Symmetry: C3
Subunit: 275 residues, 3 copies
């Protein structure tokens, strides 16, 4: 299995905050290529990201990240003077660290995990407006040695939507049976959800993956998730269960009845799927 090498690179990135059709807003890697969710930023403990943010919106907006090391200047809040005016640009710096023992003999936990970034200034000083309209994206921080996936899918429960869509227009994630698949699950907005995926399960720990025989973590297939929670996991697609149309949905009954569901399509190597 492919595994993450040691971290420690300084990386540069540019994000464009752009208007999208029908009043939505998105981050993109190039102008006119903004998506909801925004691009996935992946790094390894020790890496630094210098992210230039270009605001092509009509109102001041920002970039706030969960979990990583940043100083108040990269807070993403008006309060700490960390927002971007229309037509301007600003650099936000994200640092990360490996686990280590402090001089006092206590353990500092590393940066690795499933995280996210989003706007903190549109609509309100908590970014309620920007989050609603699509300004959110995933961040994966690896630890050295972490197993890497073949595919990555991001599910954002944004109020009563999946990635701002409802069924049947929610994303379908396709993989081949046996592929290692990574899910990143983020919740935003005003409501609490339960993420459930048919035919698959994962370990309720940092990686979603059993670490070894002394791992006492619950194995689950449903997880409560509320605004700005983030978690992730990896499955072998179709393991023990075969190819097929596997629903992923919020299991709150009114929510799934109102369209908070989508398809995880696990196919055979030739692309066929039962049904």
């Amino acid at each position: 299995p492919a595994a993450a090498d040691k971290g420690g690179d300084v990386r540069n990135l540019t994000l464009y905050m752009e208007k999208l059709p029908n009043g939505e807003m998105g981050y993109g890697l190039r102008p006119g290529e903004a998506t909801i969710p925004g691009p996935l930023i992946e790094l390894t403990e020790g890496d630094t990201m210098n992210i230039e943010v270009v605001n092509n919106l009509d109102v001041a907006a920002s970039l706030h990240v969960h979990g990583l090391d940043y100083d108040v200047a990269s807070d993403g809040t008006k309060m700490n003077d960390s927002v971007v005016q229309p037509g301007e640009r600003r650099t936000y710096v994200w640092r990360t660290h490996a686990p280590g023992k402090r001089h006092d003999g206590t353990w500092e936990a590393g940066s690795a995990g499933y995280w996210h970034y989003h706007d903190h200034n549109v609509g309100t000083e908590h970014g309620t407006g920007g989050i609603k309209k699509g300004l959110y994206g995933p961040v994966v921080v690896r630890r050295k040695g972490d197993v890497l996936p073949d595919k990555q899918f991001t599910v954002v429960f944004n109020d009563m939507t999946i990635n701002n869509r409802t069924a049947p227009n929610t994303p379908m994630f396709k993989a081949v049976r046996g592929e290692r698949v990574e899910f990143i699950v983020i919740t935003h907005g005003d409501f609490f959800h339960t993420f459930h995926v048919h035919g698959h399960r994962w370990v309720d720990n940092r990686t979603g993956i059993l670490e070894g025989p002394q791992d006492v973590s619950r194995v689950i297939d449903t997880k409560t998730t509320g605004p700005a929670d983030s978690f992730g996991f990896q499955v072998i697609a179709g393991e023990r269960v075969g190819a097929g149309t596997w629903m992923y949905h919020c299991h709150v009954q009114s929510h799934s009845d109102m369209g908070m569901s989508g398809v995880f399509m696990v196919t055979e190597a030739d692309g066929s799927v039962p049904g």
Copy 2:
């Protein structure tokens, strides 16, 4: 104490889906013996369950399970043609597995845990009407060597009820001080709850029991649980606290004031209780 043996047996079961008084629906081991919750199904990692489901309801209904290994033909969904017409029957198959190393050296987590089954077709294609009316039940999968209880009690928070009842008609669970009692807690429907039991506590891990001196798990007596969450634990009834009428309830205040509570009655050997 009694501990679960090595699994790997093929077991057969028949469930009947039956109308109950006042528009309710339950699963039963025999016609006319349907209960809410349905019968507890217990197996050990490696065991296979072949479950014949007889539908004596007036609408098509199904059986969907969390956590266990099943193919799309036992998905319990109309989408994968996995439902039972009124007056017909259909066999669903649940497989389970123990933990193990894959070829690529990674670890597959075992099936063991606190799980559940429910309808996925009555009312809506997510089972909203069937779940509402009582079509749900607990599943327990053991790992070999897991400690076994003397009693098992199932608590389902279904919307604003416990097992479709409200106080004072919610179930009283009875045990003698010192007995090993196992609780299985499932939530269904539209709302989020906090399960709490007076005078007792457990470990927030797979078994609810401390695995050993290495186990870093939180020790809790309250837990958030949302639609289709399932967990469970064992306590020694009355340990360190004595016999008594020990409340269990949802700790959301409006919910407890509206009848979401019941009694865990821990008696002396002679059946007496303080008060």
Copy 3:
């Protein structure tokens, strides 16, 4: 840093239940010195607390505790005849224990953790009115050898407030960069929240501190919390991120927009802060 000694001491405390301005109620260490939250109670596994409760309210009221060992006489409920009439007093006893093996070879988990106490009789038999008006407070139980903090901050999400207040009147917690600070987070009432603090993160286990290399727990900066949930953690203030005005808030967007936020102000040694 400082580490907790072994427990096994018997401690005595008096709490006064007192009317507060504008219809609020609080627990206090002296008459006229009640606070919301009530005073923090800290002990070590094996310690016993004898708490004399003086009810100076106009209605019968009580003391109910999570997590610790108590018999039904200290249950705090009317049903177990465990309340205090106006103008009277009553002693509640809390015991605790260390982990250990029972005779049957199973592990009994210890009492250590982040816990809380509240009224269980004012307004309703579940203390709904007493909890609403301010009758709650934190409890910290240590394990022998636990790292001890320099400061303790208690955040109680009580319905749509923090310690019964909204911004700008929510508590400001101050510490110097490098100081070891402890947060205790408790939710009460009718709603679910997600606690988030900018610039800081912790380990989702008993202590909030990484135990060592084998600790598989999710490292997080956001956590769902519902009524009577309690957790806690320690951080090194400003670690990797510097001094600053670091927001803590519920991340439910309407809740934060409606005042569920406050300031964690990390200063330099001389009291200065950026901004």
